[PDB]
Design a protein around this ligand. Sequence first.
Ligand SMILES: Nc1ncnc2c1ncn2[C@@H]1O[C@H](COP(=O)(O)OP(=O)(O)OP(O)(O)=S)[C@@H](O)[C@H]1O
Ligand SMILES: Nc1ncnc2c1ncn2[C@@H]1O[C@H](COP(=O)(O)OP(=O)(O)OP(O)(O)=S)[C@@H](O)[C@H]1O
Ligand SMILES: [Mg+2]
Lengths: 106, 325, 420, 373, 37, 95
Amino acid sequence: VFIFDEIDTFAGPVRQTLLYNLFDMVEHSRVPVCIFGCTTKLNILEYLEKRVKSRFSQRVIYMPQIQNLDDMVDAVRNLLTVRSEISPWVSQWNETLEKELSDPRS
Amino acid sequence: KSRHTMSMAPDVTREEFSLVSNFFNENFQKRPRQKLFEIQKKMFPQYWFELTQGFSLLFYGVGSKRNFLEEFAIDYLSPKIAYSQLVNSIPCLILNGYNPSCNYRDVFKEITDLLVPAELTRSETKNHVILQIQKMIDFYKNQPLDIKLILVVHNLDGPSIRKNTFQTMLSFLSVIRQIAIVASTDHIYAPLLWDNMKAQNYNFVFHDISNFEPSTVESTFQDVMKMGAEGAKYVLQSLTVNSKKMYKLLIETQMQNRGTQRTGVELKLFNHLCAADFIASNEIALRSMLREFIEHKMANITKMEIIWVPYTYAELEKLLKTVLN
Amino acid sequence: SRFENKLKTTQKHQIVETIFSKVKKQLNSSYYLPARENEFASIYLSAYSAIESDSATTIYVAGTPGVGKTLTVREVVKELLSSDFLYVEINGLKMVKPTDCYETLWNKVSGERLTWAASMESLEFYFKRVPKTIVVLLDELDAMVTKSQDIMYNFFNWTTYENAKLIVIAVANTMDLPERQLGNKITSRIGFTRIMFTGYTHEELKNIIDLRLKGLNDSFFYVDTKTGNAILVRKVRLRMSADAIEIASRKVASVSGDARRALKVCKRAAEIAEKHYMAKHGYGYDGVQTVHITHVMKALNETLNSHVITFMTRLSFTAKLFIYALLNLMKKNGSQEQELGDIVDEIKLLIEVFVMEIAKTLFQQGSDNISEQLRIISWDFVLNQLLDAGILFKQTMKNDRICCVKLNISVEEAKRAMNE
Amino acid sequence: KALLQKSSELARTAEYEQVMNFLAKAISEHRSDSLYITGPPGTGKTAQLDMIIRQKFQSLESVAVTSINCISLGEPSSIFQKIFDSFQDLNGPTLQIKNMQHLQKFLEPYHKKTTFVVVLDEMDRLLHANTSETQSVRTILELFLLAKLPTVSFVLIGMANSLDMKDRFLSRLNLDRGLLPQTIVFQPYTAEQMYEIVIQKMSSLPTIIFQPMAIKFAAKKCAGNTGDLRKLFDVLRGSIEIYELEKLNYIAKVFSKFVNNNSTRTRIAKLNIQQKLILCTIIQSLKLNSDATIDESFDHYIKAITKTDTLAPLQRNEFLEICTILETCGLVSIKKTKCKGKTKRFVDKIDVDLDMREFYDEMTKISILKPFL
Amino acid sequence: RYLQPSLFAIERLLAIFQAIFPSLMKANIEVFQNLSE
Amino acid sequence: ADAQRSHYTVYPEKRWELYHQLHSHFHDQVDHIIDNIEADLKAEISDLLYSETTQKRRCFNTIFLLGSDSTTKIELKDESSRYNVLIELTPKESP
Ligand SMILES: Nc1ncnc2c1ncn2[C@@H]1O[C@H](COP(=O)(O)OP(=O)(O)OP(O)(O)=S)[C@@H](O)[C@H]1O
Ligand SMILES: Nc1ncnc2c1ncn2[C@@H]1O[C@H](COP(=O)(O)OP(=O)(O)OP(O)(O)=S)[C@@H](O)[C@H]1O
Ligand SMILES: [Mg+2]
């Protein structure tokens, strides 16, 4: 498994060699591989040239965002709530959390 | 702005220029030139006497001094001083300043080998140039006073010697008593080169020599528009025979109307014109042997789709009657 | 060679070979050709003559990537092993420095490691002295041309020696390459063979798919109903609708004519039906099946459709507040490139031209003790967030007022996505 | 039928007669004429001198005259190393091959006093090397100086493509100095000396080696822009396999590859009527002759399609794919050009190989682009 | 007097220098000395 | 002939004696005065470089040699059980 952070900087103008070798390893190698590019430059596909993009399997996946106000409210509830029993305070602590969270005027 | 220009001049080829130039510089003012050369010959004992005092002798004046320095340094002085100290005579190290390829490292690598390698000075070789010459200086303060070397620096305002890290290098050489420094400059702003720091190290004295010499060697590296209309004059002499004809049809209607943009021709009709005389098959076969006129910058294009020749009105009819015909 | 013995491990716990697993095994890009059938001969008959006559020639082929020129010349030499030569894949892009290919050649004649300098001396000493057979592939020639053409002159000057036992095969990106990068002195040595490779056509793009689908199209699998494992309790079949394969062909031949792009869009569309089949029954990982036309409709569109429009409407408020200010200046001035201080000048002005509960929060997160902010809250943050997203672009200056800002996506779609 | 055409693909020239006059002292062991041999490219000129010296060495007295190729040096030392390789000896090499004066010590022979002439192959790599009047012209200057007093002189034979090199010489050197004078050129042989060599290179003659007037036709209608007729027989050797593949026919096959799409196959590239619309959209954006982005084109594409409602406005992502359909046929090229705000940043500027004259014909047949013009 | 200074060339100095000096001077060797000083 | 090559080396009184007894005798008075200021400049740096015991003792001692010709050489004390080194930095070596 390949883990690539900031693969856009490898996608420079001049050489692009290292991308070209791993993407051809998809095509021919008996060793099963998988490549994982992580970046933040959105239109990553135009940054590549022609001969590398044809090696590429073209499948990108966009990462989601918090699209509604209710979503992160649901997230912070799952974030702060403890579910496993450790402390005597826990059952008291869990209902204090949501009571602040359920009230929209809190 | 009707200006007469060097393009509108009766030009002269390569062999025609240099031969008649060689006629003047060896026959114009020959009698008074050696008549000057015999007059200044009596100053030669005076230079010998002052040069024992370690004085950096500097020659200014109009005209080239290159011939005069080489007579004065080689034939006159360098065996005269060897005879007066008492065996090979004193080594002469000239420096051609008009040659731009002079560096500070290479000439000083000659110097420490010209001077005595009495110690392991390669141990101090590690910019150690000012460091290595400083260890040379203080040792030379306590040596017996005699000249062992005379160096000549022609054209001290030259393109490489006038660089400032090289100038200070020569400054520390001149304070040493064992070497005599006989140099010449030609610039009118040559005393801009030195402050009272360097001239303290230099103790320059000055003498006029004006023989109005032509500077044969010193003209070679220099260039003007004598040295393109003349550039593409030679490429057409070695090509295919069809390119002569398609340039002839090019040059006619481009001179039908200086040779500027407005006299030029459109690409479509010129394709049809060079299709009319059974020359151009199509656009690609036209353009490919037109890129060869483009690659050697023999024609221009601006925007009709105007291709025009960048040579003058007078030049194209010269290109007509001589090389095309 | 060595370590492939060490790349093997033992415990392989019975991986589920589902219905669409056996498709992707042959839909792998590895394993006579229909489309470039006669041009295979045009290479080979150009190659067969020089091989059996001990000469030195040059063969120049061009074309867009995805047309088989990586493939076809491998099929040339492959049959030739049956009937005197040393095969090397001198790839251009697989060389780190351009001079490093020189090391390979001197390595691949005797087995010595010498410098790029010392190799080409003995290479030149080889190519004009040996009494009397080398096949070399100079792939992806855009890489080895870049510096000063002194490398490229060598690779064809060796061909000129009549005592040079070498056969070169150049494969480029464009036919134009010895006319817009090289000199004419190389262009004399390149020859005028110039075998052009076009794209593929959509009829042949059907004829390339079924070569992978030879023994598996409309065939039968043996399946247990409990694990989803398929074997070449039911005995099920799986069919491929050829019209959807056709509409895959009529797009890829239209835009690119690329043989990887045709296979991979079928490969992407194959796994869409894989997860929907796993969604309905859940066999995990431990009557008659098909692939609809609706799969390749999505996956071909999945090559096209974006998200920056969906990204922009799912951004923060002050992000959408920022761009709406930025288009306001671009229709005020018509200069498409506005100074950064004027934007901060505008977002102040776009307040006073619920808004107060906004304007309280927009410059301080509540807090009477620490209010009175000049520029807005997290203004460095959203401008950094719009920068690394690629939507915006900001030139570098230590002044944080007169540094110019330029848009990077089309401003109309920025205007259009703002409307939501 | 193969073995007659298997042998097809492989004193002799009428230029060798010139150079023996130019080497008139090379058989009397004296210093010959002054040899600077130039040429337009492809004219056989590399192998031309190689033909002479190989005929010289196979003919010729002690025999040692060496030739080295100036390709991978950029520097004037190891040439004087390679003349030492004909000696098979051992010495202190580095200093002797570096300085002008160091070459002079190297020119005292050992066994029988046969004079030496060097041959400098491909001199134009050092001519068209690093900056002229600093190193390379000085390198040119230093080699051509033959002021040595014995007749054992390092006579140069150097070669070049482009004929600017003589005017590059300094005015001292052009005063009849060294080997510069005899600027022996080689005009490209139309058919009148090169084809006849092909005749004598058909010594082993098959029966049907084709109507030779068509070979004469091949020579006459290739001599517009050419220099190498064996290589232009190597395009006959490809067409001679065409008559083997089918068990100037090929120049006809190769030019239609290049001439088309502007006249006819433009509409082949744009079977989509929207591809006809998007092609005129590019040229309407070319009024502002700027870095023609894919966005500024998309700007003019939307703001016109809202005025005339010929189609719905499509996506930018669709606009990405459709312009690449215009790309692979070879009409418009896309390059990542320069904008220098933050870093070297790459926006895409396009360029079209069509003219408005070849546009206006193919749009008056379709009145749906007529609103757009 | 407040603004940043303009750019010279050579001999414009000696243009102004010959004017403002107390024909009383003509030798310019020491004048060229003090420039690089 | 060779003048375009740079720096090629090659290997080709009743009154005046009364000058000779006067010139060097004068020059013995010159250089002896020259070492006087040379001993003067070397002295006044040396005592002032030492014996300055400040109380904070977390500051370097600086010395401004006004009016100096940028060539003033310095010698140092031996001062055993401690090495004392001299570093010079010319504006040519200040990039
Ligand atoms: N006619 C064909 N028959 C079978 N498989 C093919 C055919 N054409 C292409 N392929 C497959 O598709 C892949 C595409 O690679 P190629 O087209 O050979 O490479 P390419 O055309 O040189 O593109 P590059 O290498 O980036 S320039 C090949 O490796 C094969 O697996
Ligand atoms: N007249 C000829 N006689 C014999 N062989 C010839 C003749 N003309 C061409 N050839 C051969 O065909 C080749 C074509 O010339 P090229 O080598 O391509 O050009 P060139 O020899 O490099 O000269 P250039 O381009 O100016 S360096 C020659 O090298 C010879 O092998
Ligand atoms: Mg290859």
